[PDB]
Symmetry: D2
């Protein structure tokens, strides 16, 4: 018997505020200059945002408008009052951005545990955090505020997901809300049960789930208030929830291998599982200084393969071009597509269509096998 826990946070969590600002700046630059080199870090703490780093760009007007891009993103997140702890219209914004082959091993992962081919704990955690935001923004639960966190504990027996053990949903809200009479039943109804009905897991036993809504009580203020956040401090939330395997994504243009190769490996892994070649797979790519193409491409199927792993590797080599320039080309990465990736996970998204989540190589793999 094993327990596995993963978590997700809303776009209002102070670390995720930074990821989104970083990727909003990236997007704004790429929209006007697809060739922009961007490495932009964001810090938030009580009442202030500090955006720093380096860019090379011809998008001078977009660069000039970064301060406005910052405020607009914070307002979109929903921080529009001191009463909520943070206000995009009135907060401090300081900008300190300058403007004028490698050895590596990267991993990607997929598993037939959910429709989106993600491990169950992180998949359910992201579905819950996204729904928590949706019910606030659509006016379903209009007393909600932006900050929030979800945690999912699944009980396993011999690698089989048998029970939904614990779900924790913590959300910011207006001060006059009764936690027991209002928040608890509303969250259970509009967020948890709605998500569980969506997922429609064929075998998971949710009959005795321990559900904890705001277990630490009132959550009136949030975000940077009495706290701090930074870009790239939610890597495990951004990826596989600790289920599978460095370098953060947000604020980096796709020339950063930490981002584009991680994306490429997810794409490969997902297409391999969807091709029915394995129930679960970790794909590793090894790069060497002075070689564009990988020097190694390895598959681990954990005994779940339906073909010899060496043939899976051969098929991947034939179907995918894992040179960095080819990855960027094939995944059409030189576009302002990054702000949405900055909360609710980079992998297994059910609400937006991302290039590295497309099952557009399934038939190619099958034919190549």
């Amino acid at each position: 018997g094993r327990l596995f826990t993963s978590e997700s946070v809303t776009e209002g969590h102070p670390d995720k505020i930074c990821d989104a600002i970083s990727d909003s700046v990236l997007d704004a630059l790429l929209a006007a200059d697809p060739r922009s080199r961007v490495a932009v870090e964001t810090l938030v703490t009580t009442g202030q945002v500090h955006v720093v780093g380096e860019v090379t760009t011809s998008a001078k007007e977009a660069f000039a408008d970064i301060t406005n891009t910052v405020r607009a993103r914070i307002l979109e997140i929903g921080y529009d009052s001191s009463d909520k702890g943070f206000d995009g219209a009135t907060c401090g914004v300081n900008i300190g951005i300058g403007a004028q082959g490698d050895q590596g091993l990267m991993f990607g992962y997929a598993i037939n545990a959910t429709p989106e081919l993600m491990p169950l704990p992180i998949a359910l955690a992201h579905r819950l955090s996204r729904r928590l935001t949706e019910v606030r923004k659509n006016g379903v639960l209009p007393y909600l505020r932006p900050d929030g966190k979800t945690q999912v504990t699944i009980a396993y027996e011999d690698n089989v997901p048998v029970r939904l053990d614990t779900v924790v949903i913590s959300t910011q809200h207006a001060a006059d809300i009764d936690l027991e009479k209002t928040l608890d039943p509303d969250i259970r109804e509009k967020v948890l049960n709605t998500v569980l009905d969506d997922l429609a897991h064929e075998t998971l036993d949710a009959s005795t789930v321990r559900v904890l809504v705001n277990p630490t009580g009132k959550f009136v203020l949030g975000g940077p208030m009495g706290d701090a956040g930074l870009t790239g401090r939610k890597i495990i939330v951004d990826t596989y929830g600790g289920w599978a395997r460095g370098g953060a994504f947000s604020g980096k243009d796709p020339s950063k291998v930490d981002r584009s190769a991680a994306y490429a490996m997810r794409w490969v892994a997902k297409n391999v599982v969807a091709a029915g070649l394995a129930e679960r797979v970790e794909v590793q790519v090894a790069y060497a200084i002075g070689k564009a193409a990988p020097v190694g491409l390895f598959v681990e199927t954990f005994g779940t393969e339906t073909e010899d792993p060496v043939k899976i590797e051969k098929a991947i080599g034939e179907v995918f071009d894992l040179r960095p320039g080819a990855i960027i080309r094939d995944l059409n990465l030189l576009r302002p597509i990054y702000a949405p990736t900055a909360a609710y996970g980079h992998f297994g998204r059910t609400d937006v269509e991302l290039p590295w989540e497309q099952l557009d190589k399934v038939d190619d793999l099958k034919r190549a096998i």
Copy 2:
């Protein structure tokens, strides 16, 4: 298969931030062992921004934070605009205000004397040595910023070849890369480390050695760049070899389970391996809201156990007290010991004695088994 891990010196801008965050933590703990600390650092060209939240009676230490920051930067070795950054003259801004569901992991493997995976162990040995030869004046033209990368070739899980070593280091502008830097780094850093390690079977006879493959490296640190606390988690832990339960360490007092429980799991795993109970082990601890002690303690021995895994788990239960208060007590964590952890890895350190690296539970485990 090929496996690569990386380490960076204390001069890398992200590591400057980790060190500043933990230097502030240490200063507060030295005067008030019960301090609550969550301190994040940002660096970019010519400036440091330290933010977060503290609860402390160490008001004198809090007041002296700006001086603690400058002293740390000078110790790192940034003491001139010619090097790209100067602790004595740079900008310093301070904006610090003044259970849970969880799964944490720890890992150990009999691949090195320090019981760490070989790629990260060698990368950290190399980065420490690179700093050592600079500070003691052996190679006096070296400057603080640097990076090491180690690629090991494996055949059926046996480390058979040292495939590639990359050492990149900052240096004075007048240095001949081929006549001076290359042989000096080979002799004083790489070869001494290899001789120190004295691996009984690893073949180093055809290692590809690259010293500053991208050429001159004169300016470094935050210059024309940016760093943040907690952006080198893979370097801080197992180099990608073993999974992380998520969460950065630096700037956080021991009450933060992300830090202390990760340390505890390393401690458990290392003692299990040292006790000969397995060649390699991942230990997992599961916590539930409302319970002090873990609701789960799981061992994965990858087929390398010398006793039944359930018996190992039983022994760990008897020997270790994994309540948060007990971990803090048993590892004597309420002390100023953290600044040294902020570069060269938190795990597997040879150069400093860390409580979670002690083999002080080996005999207890052997008797309990």
Copy 3:
């Protein structure tokens, strides 16, 4: 015919926010270490405060608490909501002050002024402007007009004929306020009644003709957001407001954020004190006193009086009496005015001179008897 205009601002004006923060930090340090050396500058802009400079102090706890001192001062000013443009509880605060523990004079010319135009011996335009800005704040803080918000500005224009103040020409009062307030039906009459008319009754000028004053309340209209919002402020940017409203010459240098060892501050204070006592002693109707210092000498090398023809005693005799009665060595000024005390935050708005609401050492008429007996 002549017109003279001076202005004042409330403690909510963004430059005045900075002056108050700077002197609030000064006061906190002096309270625990009276010998603290302090040169603290404050910047504000949308949503953020930046406090910078250098301090030498043993008041380490006070130094650690500076961020709390900053937030408390902003809340006292009245900025407690994003709806007002600024919130002390939730705004950004960054501290970049160099700090150390402890352990000749300059060439200078400093000026002080006084004039029998008002009870507080200040020029009429600045005196009235300060009384108005102070009353504006008062009626907000005491709940008389609770819809007011912190930021505000007053302007007073006086018409003179042959140097006599004959007419109150124009009064401008601009004030921040809640969004729903009717400018013509509520704000205008409330401000006239509770601010302008009360101040005029307080002053009770025996001869000034206020019968045709042009009164303008919020001439530009709605004033809902204020302070640093969509603006910026810095310490030391309201020097004319802080002193004589342009009526009298300045020897340069701002006051706030500076401990009393800064001659720009303490000597300007000493010269006011001298001028005020000279006028109160009946020695002149108006006077500018100038002190000259030389490097290497503590005591002044020159002490000059300009009475603009209004003296009742030979100016040389006035200078002689000042020389006997006053000790204008910087060290003596500090000791005699008892300046090493947390007394500065109140000076940071509504003027450093002529204050009718607080007792300041350099405003004390405690040297009149000495001058009369010395002459």
Copy 4:
């Protein structure tokens, strides 16, 4: 006997670094968008610059380039090394300026001129600025290459019955390289290359400098400078920028403000009026006052104080100014041609009486008009 002291500082003084950054930003914006609204404040302290305020502008490329403009200004000032206390290439720069695209005041302002110097400025400030400019010049031209940017000058003149009789004291404090012997090298070099050359330039017909007390770095070594261990802000040298304390000020700093700010353009216009009045021979010295009212473009008052030195009835002088000058703010901006990138040079060495650059408000182009109108 009376003593009057004024001071000036070099472009390297931390407050002047701020004024220059603020006006360099203004210039860059005006160059591409002459209608830009600019209110830009600069702060400096150890190792960092913070530029804040608000701009309305179409000059988006110039706005994007503000950080580079800041660094280039600091480098031109001469701060290029941690060894000097500050380096424009490596220092921190943060920009907190609000930015948008385009979509009456009660006042009394003063201007002043006096026939005490060729530039029609009071002698103490005129000499102080001449000295601070020459101090910078001998560093930049390599005459005294060991000098560094920061410095300050003070001039004390002794007066007898309003006549400047003696140069009493000169204080020159300057940043310098660490190895320099203050007493044996700096002191005589400064006496020779800075003070004596300035006195030769001025060639004052009566001022007796024979026993001037000269103090070079009286407080000792000055190796580090600028923001190092200090702080500066825009608009904190108002008396240096204007008349050195000799003449009254109707409030408000100049730098970082576009010409629509009456604090700047009206102060400039008043200097212009006053200078032309003296140069027209209508008085030896004059303070001109302009009064403005809310809701009227043209002044509601224009007054002259000639301090008994007039050669024509003060009321006639006031009438002549009324005919010759259009003191509506829009007219001032048009007639002085203010919507141009001309402001960075004004940010050190004084806005008035400049002998090294040509400023519109220093031109004697209304002298003939005044004589015809009088």
